[PDB]
Amino acid sequence: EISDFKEHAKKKSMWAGALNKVTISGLMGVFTEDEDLMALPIHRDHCPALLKIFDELIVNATDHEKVTYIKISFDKGVFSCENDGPGIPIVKHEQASLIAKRDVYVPEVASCYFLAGTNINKAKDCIKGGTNGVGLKLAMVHSQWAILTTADGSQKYVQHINQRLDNIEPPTITPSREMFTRIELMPVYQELGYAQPLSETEQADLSAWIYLRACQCAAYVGKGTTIYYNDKPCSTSSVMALAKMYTLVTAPNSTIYTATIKADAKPYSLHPLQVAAVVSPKFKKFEHVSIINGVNCVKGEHVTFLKKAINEMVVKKFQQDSCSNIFVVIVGSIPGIEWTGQRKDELSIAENVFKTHYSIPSSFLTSMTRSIVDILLQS
Ligand SMILES: Nc1ncnc2c1ncn2[C@@H]1O[C@H](COP(=O)(O)OP(=O)(O)OP(=O)(O)O)[C@@H](O)[C@H]1O
């Protein structure tokens, strides 16, 4: 058989991950207990592709980020993401219109054409997460119904995109003074293994997962942008706040080691990396949370660079594993990375980029090493 994009994306895990519920190691959400935000594990199977619907929209918003807000909503199964800043241009796309037999505007190409977007010829120093021109189409292909709304300050464009991209309805274009981009959709929950409608536990888990993703965004975006989840601001705007949120239950009142890792030469020098770490004997193994180019990256040589520097100092000080008692948060942009798949689970880079260009403050390493060695000595 020869498949098309749409049918292939509905059947193949390569685009967004598994298309039913599986065990997702390290799956976390944020939950509220009287004034406090705590990240907690979600020890139930979930559908990776469903979580990717949400992630693709969220990263598109952080990529655009002037942008003063990103508003994420999740209620009655309906997910939406809206950001301000310039809208998607409301102009006819001449290629797509010529090939098709009708008018096709840019927002339809952006949302309905695979391998299409503004990052196809991305520069190596561009720090947007988006690269493939795929992610928004994956959101549409996994939607029972979806609505794209965008406005450019002179016109507003509304288009319904239904039935997993089978039913693209003609857009409605009106004069408007607004300026934003909004995607609203209902995922195909039943096809992805969920109840219709979501069960109480499915709803609670998904809401917690989205809220945590929003909190991660709050630490990544520029200081002019506010992140909202269900109309309430997400105020975990620093790596320190993230580190607290991830360690509040296990190690309350924790000391937070902080550093800004900076590079000497452009383009690396344009992109300092923010780090916060917590050291506790209660931690069973090394864990990191990395938000790189807006993407929650689970594997990359940036982590290894930090671990080796810590290990270097711990071995020396102990003489006078070294990382199993560490939880670390790393947030920032890295130019020149390559992702290993559309999911962007792992970034790829030469380890020597960090060795040549980046400096980890010695005061941060020294402070961490002292606490690490004390734990080792007390054992
Ligand atoms: N929220 C948004 N605001 C503004 N433009 C957007 C937004 N979402 C998508 N776009 C535009 O639509 C294009 C297509 O988005 P899509 O997610 O499919 O591709 P991408 O982000 O370029 O790459 P990737 O497949 O890696 O996510 C983007 O390149 C961007 O130009």
Q: Do 222 and 45 touch, CB atoms closer than 8 A?
A: no
Question: Domain boundary at 176, 211, 234, which?
Answer: 234
> CB neighbours of 225 closer than 8 A, spacing ≥ 6?
65, 66, 67, 68, 69, 70
Number of other residues whose CB lies within 10 A of the CB of residue 335: 18
Question: Which residue's C-alpha comes closest to atom 10 of ligand 1?
Answer: 60
Query: What's the token pair of residue 279?
Result: 């050291």
* Residue whose token pair is 């994420």: 72
Task: Read off the DSSP letter of residue 46.
Answer: B
Triad 157, 89, 75: Cα angle to 5°: 50
Q: Amino acid letter at 174?
A: T
Query: What's the token pair of residue 362?
Result: 């010695």
Q: Is 133 in the pocket of ligand 1 (CB under 6 A)?
A: yes
Query: What's the token pair of residue 61?
Result: 């918003």
Q: In Å, how far from its chain's centre is CA 360?
A: 25
Question: Domain boundary at 234, 249, 273, which?
Answer: 234
Burial grade of 57 (CB within 10 A; 0-12, 13-18, 19 or more): buried
With the most atoms of ligand 1 within 8 angstroms of its CB, the residue from 52, 60, 109, 342 to mutate is: 60
Helices (H) and strands (E) counted in the chain, each on its own, are 10, 19
Number of other residues whose CB lies within 10 A of the CB of residue 102: 7
Q: How far is 127 from 336, CA to CA, in rounded Å?
A: 8
The answer to whether residues 288 and 313 belong to one domain is yes
Q: Do 70 and 225 touch, CB atoms closer than 8 A?
A: yes
The β-bridge relationship of strands 226-229 and 69-75 is: parallel
Q: Is 62 in the pocket of ligand 1 (CB under 6 A)?
A: no
Q: Is 80 in the pocket of ligand 1 (CB under 6 A)?
A: no
The answer to whether residues 177 and 51 belong to one domain is yes
* Residue whose token pair is 């975990």: 236
The answer to whether residues 211 and 263 belong to one domain is no
With the most atoms of ligand 1 within 8 angstroms of its CB, the residue from 136, 179, 217, 345 to mutate is: 136
Q: Is 136 in the pocket of ligand 1 (CB under 6 A)?
A: yes
CATH value at residue 319: 3.30.230.10
User: Distances in Å between the alpha carbon of 26 and those of 19, 88, 236, 303, 306?
Assistant: 18, 35, 20, 16, 21
Q: Is 241 in the pocket of ligand 1 (CB under 6 A)?
A: no
Q: What phi-psi label fits residue 143: left (phi over 0), alpha (psi between -120 and 50 degrees) or beta?
A: beta
Range of the domain at 122: 5-234
Triad 142, 144, 150: Cα angle to 5°: 85
Q: Is 29 in the pocket of ligand 1 (CB under 6 A)?
A: no
Closest C-alpha to 107, from 138, 152, 72: 152
The answer to whether residues 132 and 261 belong to one domain is no
Triad 61, 95, 88: Cα angle to 5°: 20
State the method.
X-ray
Length of the chain counted residue by residue? 379
Query: What's the token pair of residue 98?
Result: 């010529």
The answer to whether residues 113 and 197 belong to one domain is yes
Query: What's the token pair of residue 346?
Result: 């792992």
Query: What's the token pair of residue 253?
Result: 């009142």
DSSP assignment of 150-219, as one string?
A: EEESSEEEEEEEETTTTEEPPPEEEE-S-EEEEEEEEE-TGGGT--SS--HHHHHHHHHHHHHHHHHHHH
User: Distances in Å between the alpha carbon of 142 and those of 20, 57, 165, 187, 279?
Assistant: 12, 13, 8, 6, 41
The β-bridge relationship of strands 36-41 and 28-33 is: antiparallel
Q: How far is 280 from 134, CA to CA, in rounded Å?
A: 41
Sign of CA dihedral 354, 355, 356, 360: positive
DSSP assignment of 340-357, as one string?
A: SSTT--BEE--THHHHHH
Q: How far is 319 from 235, CA to CA, in rounded Å?
A: 42
Q: Is 150 in the pocket of ligand 1 (CB under 6 A)?
A: no
Q: Amino acid letter at 52?
A: K
Question: Which residue's C-alpha comes closest to atom 29 of ligand 1?
Answer: 117
Query: What's the token pair of residue 328?
Result: 């670390």
Closest C-alpha to 87, from 155, 156, 152: 152
The answer to whether residues 187 and 215 belong to one domain is yes
Question: Domain boundary at 234, 265, 291, which?
Answer: 234
The answer to whether residues 228 and 347 belong to one domain is no
Q: Identify any residues that bridge with 331 across adjacent strands, giving them in sequence order.
A: 274, 291
Say how many Å lie between the CA of residue 60 and the centre of ligand 1: 5
Closest C-alpha to 261, from 212, 305, 197: 305
Q: Do 251 and 282 touch, CB atoms closer than 8 A?
A: yes
Task: List the strands of the sheet with 295-297, edge to edge.
Answer: 295-297, 287-292, 326-332, 273-279, 257-263, 358-359
Phi–psi pair at 190, nearest 5 degrees: -65, -40
Phi–psi pair at 239, nearest 5 degrees: -60, -30
| Number of domains, the chain | 2
Say how many Å lie between the CA of residue 164 and the centre of ligand 1: 18
With the most atoms of ligand 1 within 8 angstroms of its CB, the residue from 62, 63, 165 to mutate is: 63
Task: Read off the DSSP letter of residue 271.
Answer: -
CATH value at residue 19: 3.30.565.10
Burial 200-210 (b: 16+ CB within 10 A, else e): eebbebbbbbb
Q: Is 151 in the pocket of ligand 1 (CB under 6 A)?
A: no
The answer to whether residues 57 and 206 belong to one domain is yes
Q: What phi-psi label fits residue 294: left (phi over 0), alpha (psi between -120 and 50 degrees) or beta?
A: left
The answer to whether residues 101 and 223 belong to one domain is yes
The answer to whether residues 171 and 268 belong to one domain is no
Closest C-alpha to 31, from 248, 197, 275, 277: 248
Q: How far is 183 from 162, CA to CA, in rounded Å?
A: 13
Q: Identify any residues that bridge with 74 across adjacent strands, giving them in sequence order.
A: 79
Burial grade of 59 (CB within 10 A; 0-12, 13-18, 19 or more): buried
The answer to whether residues 215 and 275 belong to one domain is no
Q: HEC string of 110-133?
A: HHHCCCCCCCCCCCCCCCCCCCCC
Q: How far is 112 from 337, CA to CA, in rounded Å?
A: 27
The answer to whether residues 220 and 277 belong to one domain is no
Closest C-alpha to 140, from 101, 179, 109: 109
User: Distances in Å between the alpha carbon of 193 and those of 16, 146, 314?
Assistant: 15, 20, 47
Q: Is 110 in the pocket of ligand 1 (CB under 6 A)?
A: yes
Q: How far is 171 from 111, CA to CA, in rounded Å?
A: 12
User: Distances in Å between the alpha carbon of 278 and those of 252, 256, 257, 292, 372?
Assistant: 10, 5, 6, 20, 10
Ligand 1 atom with minimal separation from the 134 CA: 25
Query: What's the token pair of residue 248?
Result: 């509040």
